[PDB]
């Protein structure tokens with residue numbers, strides 16, 4: 073028997089990459105997988121990853137979810153990826169005929185986390201076992217579950233909110249300062265969507281999380297014990313979700329540059345796929361990379377959407393300034409293969425925004441991190457990485473979207489990262505645990521086998 | 529539900545590639561695949577390829593076949609690849625407990641053509657549907673089945689059901705020589721093809737004309753197993769490397785101005801022929817990618833072309849727009865790869881089924897094959913005669929037109945509603 077599993081996708085490489093990786097993991101574990109795509113994708117990288125997956129995995133069927141005519145003026149946010157989520161969610165009642173058509177009959181529908189609220193009833197109407205694909209850390213899933221209860225406890229969310237704490241089941245309490253800045257702003261579409269999704273998480277049969285048990289200490293089995301007692305769906309740790317074979321192009325220009333660099337001497341720098349630094353922070357980060365005295369691979373973005381980042385890096389910095397930076401390290405304003413770079417022996421450290429995929433990729437390849445939170449869940453993710461002993465995260469720097477860090481300060485912490493031996497030692501240790509988790513008899517491999525055997 | 533299919537592997541890089549490609553094709557068509565391997569492999573290419581398939585297809589399971597001690601004293605031949613076949617066949621009875629142990633329960637056993645006679649009864653014991661993976665052209669397959677009745681009775685010809693008659697001159701050179709281990713197998717196998725459930729041929733309907741349905745109608749009446757057209761067998765994912773030294777060289781060459789020359793993994797040219805093929809490649813005035821199997825002119829050759837004495841990614845070279853033609857030995861795997869990438873080919877048969885394949889290639893309108901050359905093992909060709917033949921190849925526009933036409937016919941065959949896709953789905957919808 074081979075259980076048929078559907079994947080409901082949403083906007084963003086931060087959501088697509090674990091979706092496609094998990095889809096690949098499923099197919100390699102004797103399951104038939106059907107991914108439900110929507111077009112046109114907000115970014116080009118989204119289109120390529122799907123096509124490459126479908127090319128490398130012909131047995132993965134694609135069914136297109138045609139969304140309703142969307143009026144962006146109705147939505148609160150101006151974020152192209154968030155707007156996409158809502159467009160899908162507003163077309164929720166049309167997924168039902170799409171799913172019934174699918175042959176052979178599905179065993180489970182794996183819903184993307186931003187789409188849980190709107191689409192988990194659709195699975196219930198079809199008596200379909202539904203599972204949440206959570207793309208962030210377990211500590212964030214726990215907050216997003218708890219946050220609806222927290223906001224209901226406040227008369228006014230404006231003034232009564234200083235910097236107290238929000239209690240999390242099984243985790244260290246989260247300060248308001250580590251909470252996604254958009255959460256303070258209820259009546260923001262992102263906030264209202266996550267509040268709804270976190271409320272509906274309990275309606276799913278389980279929650280897929282890109283993590284392994286050794287990463288969080290020994291708190292996960294106890295949490296699930298209490299979750300089962302409280303009638304909540306279990307946390308299903310299936311991470312680290314392995315990168316697909318199409319994510320490895322051995323002949324990339326940045327990879328070839330790395331081959332000429334001393335091992336462990338290069339600082340990889342990136343802030344994800346949907347966020348860009350301010351012009352001032354970009355100019356300062358470039359200054360800090362020169363001051364660091366370390367070889368660096370810097371990935372730059374001036375806009376969120378790659379399609380729209382048409383401006384040459386020259387106009388932002390000046391030809392002279394940019395010409396100077398290229399002398400000290402590799403700089404590219406284009407999509408690069410992150411995990412392929414992270415596995416390169418030349419990379420000794422990673423300056424990241426704190427996105428979970430990047431973080432988990434670094435965990436998987438054993439690269440020490442300097443987490444520089446910019447927005448959203450990156451501060452909560454920062455704290456997870458710090459307690460893991462793999463990364464350092466400068467609380468002094470605050471949020472990147474609201475605080476500016478100058479060149480001298482940036483250069484010193486990169487030095488600290490490059491010479492931080494405890495992070496290096498933990499990196500090798502933590503990587504071997506991640507590998508052991510997906511190997512047969514591993515923690516993650518055990519949970520995935522249990523899921524498939526139930527499907528079936 | 530996912531049907532579990534077992535692939536019986538034999539030695540031979542020529543036989544391994546279609547097996548590994550059909551194994552992948554099965555997985556991509558929703559089947560669980562278990563390949564039966566034997567170690568140590570004859571060549572590193574086999575070991576490397578098998579490892580790369582297992583590395584890229586974790587869901588495919590490998591169960592090693594441990595064989596009886598071979599007695600290479602007899603050994604009715606000195607060929608390393610053929611000798612292993614008999615070593616596999618001598619221990620055919622030892623497969624039963626292995627195949628039975630395989631879980632989940634198997635739906636079909638795809639057995640490689642050289643071991644059919646010795647392994648088709650093994651499928652009968654397990655109540656398993658048996659399929660033979662034929663690695664050569666359809667014309668060769670009929671010759672293989674019609675040959676045993678023929679020896680039960682030279683410029684003459686052998687009558688072949690469904691095809692043009694084959695001259696004894698195009699028949700494999702070892703076929704005339706009975707008492708050869710190669711022959712004895714082929715005789716036994718050909719008489720045993722009727723015992724199997726289906727013959728899997730790396731081909732599509734359009735390539736052999738509309739004769740395949742008419743044949744299958746006739747085949748069914750006599751109680752014979754059907755011809756299963758599942759071609760072309762597309763190269764696996766591990767069979768493409770974004771940067772190889774040859775690929776980087778092609779990127780500096782004009783579109784379709786390069787002649788690719790390869791004679792397969794098994795065969796090796798004579799020292800005299802290599803020196804003659806070299807001068808002919810210079811005399812052609814063309815760019816060329818030369819694959820050599822076994823100093824003053826070593827520099828001269830590299831001036832207007834590329835020379836390599838190593839395993840290359842053939843299918844990736846043939847996809848490249850810089851390659852305008854293919855000087856091939858005529859191996860059906862190499863031939864079908866040129867069909868897939870629409871590369872017109874100069875067929876130079878050297879041994880075995882290559883004269884037969886050449887006859888199939890000529891009728892396809894995809895290639896030219898020089899009858900004035902005969903067998904490469906039996907004949908030597910001067911540089912002057914070679915160059916003019918390559919020049920005719922590069923300047924043969926009607927070949928290139930039929931080439932581009934056939935690639936579309938081939939590509940449409942594996943697409944949905946295509947020829948090969950239909951027969952494949954029907955097979956798996958019977959297993960089911």
Ligand SMILES: O=c1ccn([C@@H]2O[C@H](COP(=O)(O)OP(=O)(O)O)[C@@H](O)[C@H]2O)c(=O)[nH]1
Nearest residue numbers: 086344345346407408409410427428429430
């Ligand atoms: O230039 C880039 C930028 C992004 N990524 C990939 O995009 C994903 C982004 O994941 P993340 O958790 O950081 O989500 P995000 O912050 O981008 O929303 C990571 O897996 C990276 O490997 C990449 O390969 N190259």
Ligand SMILES: O=c1ccn([C@@H]2O[C@H](COP(=O)(O)OP(=O)(O)O)[C@@H](O)[C@H]2O)c(=O)[nH]1
Nearest residue numbers: 542792793794839840841842859860861862
């Ligand atoms: O230098 C080489 C020689 C062989 N091949 C591959 O090996 C297979 C050999 O198949 P063939 O029909 O020629 O069998 P052979 O005559 O070599 O035994 C072909 O598909 C080629 O793709 C290759 O990739 N590089």
